[PDB]
Amino acid sequence: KTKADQEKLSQALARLAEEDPTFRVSTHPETGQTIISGMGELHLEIIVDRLKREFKVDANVGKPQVAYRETITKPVDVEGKFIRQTGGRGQYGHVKIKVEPLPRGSGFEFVNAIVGGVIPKEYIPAVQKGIEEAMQSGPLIGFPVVDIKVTLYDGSYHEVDSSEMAFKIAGSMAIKEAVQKGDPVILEPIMRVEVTTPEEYMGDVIGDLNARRGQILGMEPRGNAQVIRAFVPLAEMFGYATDLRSKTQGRGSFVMFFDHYQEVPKQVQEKLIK
């Protein structure tokens, strides 16, 4: 809750983490919020009493967030101009680039596409720190615009006006628009899961998984059990413990691993614009 209680909580674990190492407290290193590792609904639940009562902290209990990503569909190419000739530090930076989407899981790639050198040598690092920068806050919501290849294939400059910095903008302008133009697309996190389950409960097991935006990959049996592998979205994945152990009266266990990122079904496009 208000930063006030942020403290009562600190001590909360500072003593509760000695009095029970069967959990783990983690501050999401990308976005404040802290995760509370538990070992079952009830578990986290009963901590919610003690930690909220015998410690009288009264905070929030919703769910983890999802590491989205931004990017684009169609490749574009725009002008990146900047120039400000008034009288001196002219501030003069201007480039044109080549933006092209890359396969979901391609990475980050620039292209020093300049002929003889209409774009000076010494100014590129900064033209990139510019582009690289701007990829931070997505065009859609604000998240790491990824999976693209950038090509610097022109750009002039000024003898006295340009600056290392002036390019960092120009370049951070050409990028701040290529993305806006090439129709953004909300990528999202997919996981790898494997429920260990007696093909008894299976039946619904897979169903359940299907009606979770997820799509199966297989089930090569084991012992009296049978394993099921497949991908799912972290959003439509929550609180799976007391969902699996449900459809299995307890004889059910799973794992989870990250894998790739992937576009949202448009229905989920305008959903996220909230």
Partner 1 sequence: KKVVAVVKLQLPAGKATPAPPVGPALGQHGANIMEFVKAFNAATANMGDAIVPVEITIYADRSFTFVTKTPPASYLIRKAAGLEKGAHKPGREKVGRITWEQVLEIAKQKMPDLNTTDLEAAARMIAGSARSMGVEVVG
Partner RNA sequence: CAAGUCUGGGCUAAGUGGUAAAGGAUGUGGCGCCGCGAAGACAGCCAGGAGGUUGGCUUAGAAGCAGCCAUCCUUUAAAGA
Tell me which residues touch partner 1 (CB under 8 A). Answer: 199, 220-221, 226
Q: Which does 88 bind (CB under 5 to 8 A by kind): partner 1, RNA, none?
A: none
Query: Is there a contact between 153 and 98 (Cβ–Cβ < 8 Å)?
Result: yes
218 lines the binding site for RNA (CB under 7 A): yes
83 lines the binding site for RNA (CB under 7 A): no
Q: Which does 221 bind (CB under 5 to 8 A by kind): RNA, partner 1, none?
A: partner 1
Task: Write each residue from 32 to 71 as x if it is in contact with RNA (CB under 7 A), else as -, in one continuous string.
Answer: ----------------------------------------
Pick between residue 71 and residue 226 the one whose CB is nearest to partner 1.
Answer: 226
Pick between residue 91 and residue 226 the one whose CB is nearest to RNA.
Answer: 226
Strand order in the sheet with 227-233: 215-218, 227-233, 188-196, 256-262
Using the contact rule CB under 7 A, the part of the chain among 44-52, 88-96, 180-188, 209-217 near RNA is 209-217
204 lines the binding site for RNA (CB under 7 A): no
Rounded CA separation 3/11 (Å): 14
Query: Is there a contact between 92 and 166 (Cβ–Cβ < 8 Å)?
Result: yes
| Beta pairing class for 94-101 and 256-262 | unpaired
Q: Which does 218 bind (CB under 5 to 8 A by kind): partner 1, RNA, none?
A: RNA
Rounded CA separation 51/189 (Å): 31
Q: Smallest distance, Å, CB 226 to partner 1?
A: 8
199 lines the binding site for RNA (CB under 7 A): no
Query: Is there a contact between 179 and 78 (Cβ–Cβ < 8 Å)?
Result: no
* 172: alpha, beta or left? (left if phi > 0; alpha if psi -120 to 50): alpha
Pick between residue 123 and residue 231 the one whose CB is nearest to RNA.
Answer: 231
Q: Smallest distance, Å, CB 231 to RNA?
A: 11
206 lines the binding site for RNA (CB under 7 A): yes
Pick between residue 97 and residue 219 the one whose CB is nearest to partner 1.
Answer: 219
Rounded CA separation 83/194 (Å): 56
Rounded CA separation 71/134 (Å): 12
Residue 134, helix vs strand vs coil: helix
Our CA angle for 49, 50, 53, nearest 5°, is: 80
217 lines the binding site for RNA (CB under 7 A): yes
216 lines the binding site for RNA (CB under 7 A): yes
The residues binding RNA (CB under 7 A) are 206, 210, 216-218
